[PDB]
Amino acid sequence: KDTYGFSILDIVINNPVNLTIHFGGEKGKRIRENYSAMIFETIVDGKLKTEKIFKEINEHSTSYTFRSEKG
Amino acid sequence: LPMSPNHGTFGGDGMYSESKLSLETLFNRWHSESWANQLTVCGAIIGW
Numbered sequence: 001k002d003t004y005g006f007s008i009l010d011i012v013i014n015n016p017v018n019l020t021i022h023f024g025g026e027k028g029k030r031i032r033e034n035y036s037a038m039i040f041e042t043i044v045d046g047k048l049k050t051e052k053i054f055k056e057i058n059e060h061s062t063s064y065t066f067r068s069e070k071g
Numbered sequence: 072l073p074m075s076p077n078h079g080t081f082g083g084d085g086m087y088s089e090s091k092l093s094l095e096t097l098f099n100r101w102h103s104e105s106w107a108n109q110l111t112v113c114g115a116i117i118g119w
Contacts, residue, residue, distance in 0.1 A: 025108050 005031040006066075015071035022063045032057060035064060072097065074114045 001007060005021045005028070023032035038053040057064055075091035097112045 027108070 003031070003034050017068050017071055019066040020063050021066075023061060032059075032061060032064075072112065072114045074116045076116050076118065 005023075006019060010016075011019070021031060021035070022028055035054050035057050036052075040051040040053055042049050042051070054064060072094050073091075074094055075088065078088040078092040080088075095114060098114065101107050101110070101112045
């Protein structure tokens with residue numbers, strides 16, 4: 001909850017198909033920064049590529065949505 | 072919040088001025104109560 005603004009207990013209990021994290025208020029901004037800091041780093045051919053997970057999320061993103069087909 | 076610039080300037084409007092003027096307490100209530108994270112207050116003082 002504090003880092004990414006979601007409840008693993010709630011996800012286990014309800015198996016939501018979609019989960020919308022909202023980035024409103026200071027808490028939402030901190031969660032958004034945590035989401036933006038998530039990176040996928042990879043040294044391929046001796047070069048450290050840094051892809052970004054959640055490329056959608058930026059400083060103007062008010063929400064992100066985890067999607068699933070069934071849960 | 073639809074706010075009026077005038078609170079009793081014209082008169083003869085019942086409690087309109089009272090409603091609009093008391094609507095400005097929400098600015099202080101937002102800081103002083105525990106509903107700041109669920110609602111934000113935007114008082115728009117509507118002109119003529």
